[PDB]
Amino acid sequence: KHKILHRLLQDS
C-alpha cells in the first residue's frame, strides 16, 4: 500500500 509514504513523496 505505502499510502502515507506515496502521499509524502507526491506532496509539493
Next chain:
Amino acid sequence: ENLYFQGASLTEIEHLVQSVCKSYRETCQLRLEDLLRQRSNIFSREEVTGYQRKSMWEMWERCAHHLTEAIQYVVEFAKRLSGFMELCQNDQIVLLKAGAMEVVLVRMCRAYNADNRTVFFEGKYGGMELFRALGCSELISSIFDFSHSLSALHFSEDEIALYTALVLINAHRPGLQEKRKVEQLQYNLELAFHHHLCKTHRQSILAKLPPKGKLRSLCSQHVERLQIFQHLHPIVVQAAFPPLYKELFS
C-alpha cells in the same frame, strides 16, 4: 536528469557539500544549540518512576509517535537531497524503508549526552532506565551504546548531514530498480563527505565510523521487538500506532 548521476568535477562536488548541508539545516527537527542548552534539564527520580510505571502499550505508542515525527523530517531531508526526486517512486520508497530508521539512529547522537549517558526525550534528559516499561532493555542498551560511540567522534552538523545523506543513498538496498543511478549518486555523495573531511582535517574519523552491519543490526532488532509487542497487543498497533510507522516497520 541530474548532474550527480554522472561523473562530477571538484567544483560540482564542492556544491554537493553545500547543498547536502543546507538540506540538513532546513530538516533537522531540533537545533543543536537547543539540545545542548537543555542538557542541565534532567528527569527527576519521581519523573523516572512515573515513566517506569506506564503500561507497556502506552510507552510503545509514545515511542512510535516520537519516532514517526523524527522520520517525517528524514523524509523531507531525502526530498531535498540532490538527485533523490529524480529516482523512480519504487527506488525512493526502497531507500526510505531501509534507511529512514538508520538516519534517525544517527541523528539521535546530537540528542545524546555522553557525560551522564542521557537522551533528550519529551522535554528533558533521561537515562536508559526511563524506557524500562517497553520491555526491550537489550535494544535500548544497544541504542544508547551506539549513540555513545557516535558521540565520541564529536561530529559537527555538516558531518552528520553528509554522513546521513550516505546512510540513505545506499546502492546496495535490495529492490532498487535503477541501481547504477543510485551507485553514481552514492559515489558523488561519498566524494562530498570525504572532501569535507579532507578540507577540515577530519579524515581520522573514517576508520572510527561504525560498520554498515551495526546499523542493520539495530534496525533488525527494532523490527524484532516490534513483532513481539505486536503479538501481545495487536489492537494497539492496529488502532493507535501512526500509519507511517506501520508502513515502514510492520
